[PDB]
Amino acid sequence: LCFKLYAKGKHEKKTWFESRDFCRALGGDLASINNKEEQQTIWRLITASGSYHKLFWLGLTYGSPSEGFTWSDGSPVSYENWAYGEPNNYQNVEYCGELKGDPTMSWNDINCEHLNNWICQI
Numbered sequence: 001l002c003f004k005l006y007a008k009g010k011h012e013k014k015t016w017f018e019s020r021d022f023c024r025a026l027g028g029d030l031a032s033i034n035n036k037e038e039q040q041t042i043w044r045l046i047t048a049s050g051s052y053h054k055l056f057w058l059g060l061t062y063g064s065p066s067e068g069f070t071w072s073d074g075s076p077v078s079y080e081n082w083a084y085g086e087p088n089n090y091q092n093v094e095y096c097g098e099l100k101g102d103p104t105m106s107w108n109d110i111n112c113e114h115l116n117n118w119i120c121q122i
């Protein structure tokens, strides 16, 4: 699949569900990162755009209490790159996952209504 970053104006940021709908309207989904190669591809897109340290929705969303986090495209959550201490479900309201667009490419759980940039896969 091909990845595309969306870092529009800050008043153009979207919730997790709005971002999922945007990507699904293109016939795709929010990006799943299933291995280090995909991670590098996205990191290089970040460097090419020159937009460093920005946060982006990924396809991470909580499933049942038993499952924990899942990918919206149904891919397995085998590879994980959570930031240290994450997921921390801060204040019990963090059920979606974002990417921190710096070299570490780490993941964080955050409230799904938070406004973020996003990354689609097509």
Ligand SMILES: CC(=O)N[C@@H]1[C@@H](O[C@@H]2O[C@H](CO)[C@H](O)[C@H](O)[C@H]2O)[C@H](O[C@@H]2O[C@@H](C)[C@@H](O)[C@@H](O)[C@@H]2O)[C@@H](CO)O[C@H]1O
Residues within 6 Å of the ligand: 055, 086, 088, 090, 094, 108, 109, 110, 111
């Ligand atoms: C600048 C600052 O002090 N931010 C605090 C939040 O931590 C940042 O959260 C963002 C989330 O996009 C990012 O992870 C930064 O690296 C953090 O410094 C803090 O958020 C809470 O703790 C985070 C570590 C993370 O788990 C986040 O999901 C969680 O809500 C909030 C709430 O304590 O306070 C901010 O001041």
Ligand SMILES: [Ca+2]
Residues within 6 Å of the ligand: 031, 032, 033, 034, 038, 075
């Ligand atoms: Ca993937």
Ligand SMILES: [Ca+2]
Residues within 6 Å of the ligand: 086, 087, 088, 089, 090, 094, 108, 109, 110
């Ligand atoms: Ca968190």
